[PDB]
Design an enzyme around this catalytic site. Structure first.
Site, PDB file in Angstrom:
ATOM      1  N   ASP A   9      69.228  16.823  44.408  1.00 49.75           N
ATOM      2  CA  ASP A   9      67.990  16.078  44.239  1.00 49.75           C
ATOM      3  C   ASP A   9      68.332  14.657  43.799  1.00 49.75           C
ATOM      4  OD1 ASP A   9      66.372  18.745  44.349  1.00 49.75           O
ATOM      5  OD2 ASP A   9      67.603  18.984  42.542  1.00 49.75           O
ATOM      6  N   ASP A 117      58.092  26.679  50.605  1.00 55.87           N
ATOM      7  CA  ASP A 117      57.938  27.038  49.207  1.00 55.87           C
ATOM      8  C   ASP A 117      56.831  28.079  49.124  1.00 55.87           C
ATOM      9  OD1 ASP A 117      59.876  25.071  48.626  1.00 55.87           O
ATOM     10  OD2 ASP A 117      58.327  23.526  48.441  1.00 55.87           O
TER      11      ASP A 117
END
EC number: 4.3.2.10
Length: 237
Positions: A9, A117
Site C-alpha cells: 500500500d 472485497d
C-alpha cells in the site's frame, strides 16, 4: 504453480523504504509477484501512479499489479503501457462491468485483476465497493460469475472481516468462491503465520496475498516457500 504475492500500500510515492527498493528486496527474497495499492490525493493520483509504475518497471522483473482508484480504460491503459503487467479494478468494475471486457480486449484477460472485497451481511456474502464503505447489495455468488463472464483473468479476493487481524485467512469464503469460477483466486487478508497460508491453498486459492506480515518480518518467504513445499503445496522455489 502457487504464488506468494506481496502487497504494498502506497501513498504519494511512499509506503503507507520507498515502494521500489521494497519490491526490489521482495523480488530477491523469493516473492513471485507484487501488488501496489495507491491511496493518493486524487488530484496528484494519476501522475503519482504513472511515476510509480515507471520506477518499479525500471528495476523489477517479476510480474506486478497496480490498482486503486482506476476508474476507466484510459487510466488502465496508460498504467499498463507505462510498465505494469496487470491492473486491479474493484469499484469501477462493479459500477461498470463492461470495463472488464474493455481492458481485457486490448491487454488480454491476464492483464485484468478484479479486486472483490466481500463481507458477511445477514448470513450472505456481499460485495463492497469504495474500500468497504458501500454494501452494493450484490451477492458475491452472482458477482464472481459475472466477473469471469466479462473477461477477467484473476480475482483478488479480500475478506474485510479478517483483513489486518493476523488471525487467519477466510477459508470458508475461498471455499465458497472456489466452485464458482475458473480464474486464479488471490486470497488476501488474515494471514499472520505460515499455517494460514497452507489453510488458504487447501481452500482452493491459487495465490496468497499478504501486506503487514511480510513488512514487519513476521514471516520469511523463503522459509514460507520451504514450509508449504514440505507439506505438498506446489510453490516455485
Amino acid at each position: 504453480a502457487k504464488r506468494i504475492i506481496a502487497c504494498l500500500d502506497v501513498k504519494d510515492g511512499r509506503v503507507v523504504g520507498d515502494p521500489v527498493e521494497l519490491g526490489k528486496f521482495y523480488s530477491e527474497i523469493g516473492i513471485d509477484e507484487l501488488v501496489f495499492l495507491d491511496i493518493t490525493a486524487s488530484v496528484e493520483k494519476r501522475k503519482t501512479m504513472l511515476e510509480l509504475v515507471e520506477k518499479v518497471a525500471e528495476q523489477i522483473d517479476i510480474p506486478f499489479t497496480v490498482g486503486g482508484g482506476i476508474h476507466d480504460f484510459e487510466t488502465a491503459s496508460e498504467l499498463i503501457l507505462r510498465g505494469a503487467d496487470k491492473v486491479s479494478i474493484n469499484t469501477a468494475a462493479v459500477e461498470n462491468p463492461s470495463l472488464i471486457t474493455q481492458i481485457a480486449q486490448t491487454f488480454g484477460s491476464q492483464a485484468v485483476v478484479v479486486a472483490i472485497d466481500a463481507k458477511r451481511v445477514d448470513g450472505e456474502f456481499m460485495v463492497f465497493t469504495y474500500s468497504g464503505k458501500k454494501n452494493t447489495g450484490i451477492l458475491l455468488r452472482d458477482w464472481v460469475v459475472e466477473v469471469e463472464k466479462r473477461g477477467a483473468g484473476e480475482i483478488l479476493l479480500t475478506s474485510i472481516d479478517r483483513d489486518g487481524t493476523k488471525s487467519g485467512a477466510d477459508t470458508e469464503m475461498i471455499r465458497f468462491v472456489r466452485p464458482l469460477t475458473t480464474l486464479p483466486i488471490i486470497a488476501s487478508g488474515g494471514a499472520g503465520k505460515m499455517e494460514h497460508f497452507l489453510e488458504a491453498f487447501l481452500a482452493g486459492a491459487d495465490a496468497a496475498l499478504a501486506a503487514s506480515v511480510f513488512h514487519f518480518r513476521e514471516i520469511d518467504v523463503r522459509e514460507l516457500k520451504e514450509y508449504l513445499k514440505k507439506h505438498g503445496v506446489n510453490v516455485r522455489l
